């Protein structure tokens, strides 16, 4: 597995799906980067390097597989079963009622990010709570710009716009290369355009598997699956897929989640927006009670568009 | 340049509070200290820091030592207020808020008047600016407390 590290020179824009044309709708608000955007940046580099075989021009997916992405300062969205109570974010474990897994009422969820070490303790079921100071928020930087007339140096009519950028220190991407020679091509490049407004990020590439993908969790009936990237597909099909890949049937499951992630994007091949897809948002947790004990995998890919970085679930246990 | 302002404000509040504490029933002393605090920067502007310190000296000697001053041992309000202001200004330039704080003075414990006689013109200029700045803070708390 190859590990790509993107270091933004300054700011990044991963624009939400909304009109953003000069002289009209003029507000661009960034979201947390979707893995397909990172995949697109890599595919575009290969598209220009002449490796159009691995790109998948006009195709939904490339030949290579983007395992997933993570932002860094490496941090992850607070699991949705972690609820803020006073100055602490408390882990809420599944309960049972009428023979069904439920999450007991303990307050509303508040968004935020935690370090990889805090997530690791969570996945091992050893995390009780997190002090509110260790819960990170992503910094935004709002910039307001204009367009000037060529000669008179005054603002052209209606040419004012606003961008809410993200201030991100690092983005990590992991790629499985079936022999396209991506590691060599990425090594030849120092930087690439990532997201909107022609912002660039420095590129480093190392041949390594992150330790979080190599954890030994043991065997249990009570496994959980933390989605680190958006996961596309019906919950039923995802659970069924999970049953097949682990060769074990499920007694019951509970999806703790939030607002669905709206995913469209821009088709650079056809020069028009991509079709809207809906996904289980990062930070969502699928609690599963298998009928038999399973060896909980450190990570597992689920749902549609796996090669674009979607459906990266991190294994964990609960009691 | 912001932390130094806080340090000055801390010192200023302290010395004015000591004035108001020791001479609570004595409005003449409090009023004299206030007036002299207001006049002090003017004397410095028109005569220089050296002359001003010398002027304070004449309101009190064997040696020039601000430490040896005892403001409470004087007979009238004029001399008491002068001795206090003089010691306050000198203490700030020499000691700051103590050596356990961010600002511990400019002259390293040496009396500012003798300091001016010995050091460079640059050393005198920074001591002059600093003197004006601490008096400016003393004036603030004086008007509000005295």
């Amino acid at each position: 597995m190859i590990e790509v590290t993107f270091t933004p020179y300054d700011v990044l824009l991963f624009r939400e799906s909304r009109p953003f044309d000069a002289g009209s709708e003029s507000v661009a608000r960034s979201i947390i980067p979707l893995p397909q955007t990172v995949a697109g940046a890599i595919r575009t580099l290969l598209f220009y390097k002449g490796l159009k075989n691995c790109v998948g021009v006009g195709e939904e997916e490339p030949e290579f597989t983007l395992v997933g992405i993570a932002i860094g300062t490496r941090i992850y969205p607070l699991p949705f079963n972690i609820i803020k109570s006073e100055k602490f974010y408390k882990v809420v474990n599944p309960g049972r009622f009428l023979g069904k897994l439920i999450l007991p009422p303990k307050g509303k969820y508040k968004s935020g990010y935690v370090t990889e070490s805090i997530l690791e303790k969570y996945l091992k079921g050893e995390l009780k709570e997190v002090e509110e100071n260790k819960v990170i928020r992503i910094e935004k930087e709002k910039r307001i710009g204009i367009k000037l007339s060529r000669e008179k140096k005054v603002v052209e009519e209606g040419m004012l716009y606003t961008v809410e950028f993200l201030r991100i220190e690092k983005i990590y991407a992991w790629i499985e290369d079936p022999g396209c020679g991506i590691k060599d091509i990425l090594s030849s490049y120092e930087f690439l355009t990532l997201g909107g407004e022609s912002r660039v990020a420095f590129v480093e590439v190392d041949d390594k598997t992150p330790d979080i993908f190599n954890r030994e969790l043991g065997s249990t009936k009570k496994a959980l699956f933390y989605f680190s990237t958006p996961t596309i597909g019906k919950v039923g099909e995802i659970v069924q897929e999970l049953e097949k890949r682990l060769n074990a049937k499920i007694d019951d499951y509970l999806l703790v989640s939030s607002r669905p992630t709206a995913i469209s994007g821009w088709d650079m091949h056809e020069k028009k927006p991509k079709g809207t897809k809906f996904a289980i948002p990062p930070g969502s947790v699928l609690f599963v009670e298998f009928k038999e004990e399973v060896e909980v995998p450190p990570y597992i890919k689920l749902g549609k568009l796996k090669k674009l970085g979607y459906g990266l679930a991190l294994g964990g246990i609960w009691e | 340049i912001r932390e130094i302002e806080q340090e000055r404000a801390s010192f200023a509040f302290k010395v004015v509070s000591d004035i108001k504490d020791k001479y609570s029933q004595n409005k003449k002393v409090q009023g004299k200290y206030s007036s002299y605090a207001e006049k002090a920067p003017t004397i410095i502007l028109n005569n220089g820091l050296g002359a001003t310190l010398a002027f304070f000296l004449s309101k009190l000697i064997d040696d020039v030592d601000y430490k040896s001053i005892n403001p409470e041992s004087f007979g009238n309000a004029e001399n008491i207020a002068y001795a206090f202001l003089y010691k306050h200004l000198s203490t700030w330039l020499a000691e700051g808020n103590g050596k356990d704080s961010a600002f511990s003075g400019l002259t390293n414990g040496e009396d500012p008047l003798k300091y001016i006689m010995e050091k460079t013109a640059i050393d005198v200029a920074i001591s002059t600016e600093e003197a004006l700045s601490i008096l400016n803070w003393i004036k603030k708390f004086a008007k509000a407390m005295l």
């Binding site: 300054d10 709002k142 367009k147 060529r150 120092e190 912002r199 420095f202 | 340049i1 460079t120 640059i122």
Partner: protein, 322 residues
């Protein structure tokens, strides 16, 4: 490839930020995370594009021959050249090389992208009044670490009371430096200032915008991160401006406001990331990244630009080294 643009202010600079939170009416652009003064990539790009465009239209661009954009437009767009040139005169589009380097004017945006990515101008040296040597070129470990990281990828420990400074700032024998009205004690150090100067020399050359870089070494002051941040936020120029009602000879109603300025003698740097030119049927002399980089260097090296607002009251002028 990429070009590093060094920017040295010779007059105060007002790169306006409406979104900046401040007690000042018109504050300058700043970085969200560090609070450091900055010039946005988009502001700088606009400046660079406008200068480049004027030169192209005036046939002053060199590629080592005179660039004739209308001639090149015809040998590129062929049958569609005349209507394009018409749009340029109608200010609906920009001349050929300008659009190749910086992208099409908004009317033709979807056709292709601009070859260059203009990065933020990040602060490097900030001038602070010094009791000795008039003023110091002040920086911090976090700044030096950022510079080193940006350069390494494109290719220090101090307390709040300490400074690593050049000889021209240090009071004789007292081992002290006085920046404005505060005193910093000199920390003994051998190569950090020297290392920094070497980095500056490797990026901008022997001459430091019209002076030997060795002269700068004697007046560099490295201070702690908190102290540097304090100076960049509270030592910038804060100037009151008014409008006079000449009928009365007094200040007009609503005619008083405050404006912030980045001082002259500030050093900033912007990395210009250059991709391949994306327009179809490119002329040979500008058909790849290196050729775009070369034109950028020749056009802007040793140039004078005006950045930000208040041009007509003498603000925003910088020297450029590319």
């Amino acid at each position: 490839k990429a070009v590093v643009f060094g920017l040295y202010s010779i007059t105060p600079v007002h790169a306006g930020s409406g979104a900046e939170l401040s007690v000042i009416d018109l504050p300058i652009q700043r970085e969200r995370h560090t609070g450091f003064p900055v010039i946005w990539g988009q502001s700088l790009k606009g400046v660079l594009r406008s200068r480049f465009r004027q030169l192209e239209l005036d046939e002053k661009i060199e590629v080592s021959q005179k660039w004739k954009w209308k001639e090149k437009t015809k040998e590129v767009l062929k049958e569609k050249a005349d209507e394009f040139i018409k749009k340029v005169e109608e200010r609906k589009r920009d001349p050929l090389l300008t659009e190749i380097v910086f992208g099409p004017a908004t009317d033709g945006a979807s056709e292709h992208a601009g070859a260059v990515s203009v990065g933020d101008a990040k602060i490097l040296l900030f001038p602070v009044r010094s009791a000795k040597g008039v003023f110091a070129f002040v920086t911090s470990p976090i700044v030096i670490q950022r510079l080193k990281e940006d350069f390494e990828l494109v290719s220090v420990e101090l307390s709040n009371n300490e400074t690593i400074a050049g000889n021209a700032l240090i009071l004789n024998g007292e081992n002290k430096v006085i920046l404005e009205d505060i005193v910093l004690k000199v920390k003994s150090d051998s190569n950090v200032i020297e290392n920094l100067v070497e980095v500056l020399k490797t990026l901008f050359g022997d001459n430091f915008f019209g002076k030997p870089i060795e002269s700068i070494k004697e007046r560099i002051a490295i201070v702690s991160d908190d102290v540097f941040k304090s100076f960049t936020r509270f030592s910038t120029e804060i100037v009151a401006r008014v409008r006079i009602d000449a009928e009365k000879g007094t200040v007009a109603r609503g005619g008083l406001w405050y404006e912030e300025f980045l001082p002259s003698d500030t050093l900033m740097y912007s990395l210009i990331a250059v991709g391949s030119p994306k327009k179809e049927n490119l002329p040979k002399e500008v058909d790849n990244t290196q050729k775009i980089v070369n034109v950028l260097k020749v056009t802007f090296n040793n140039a004078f630009l005006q950045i930000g607002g208040d041009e007509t009251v003498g603000k925003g002028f910088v020297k450029v080294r590319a």
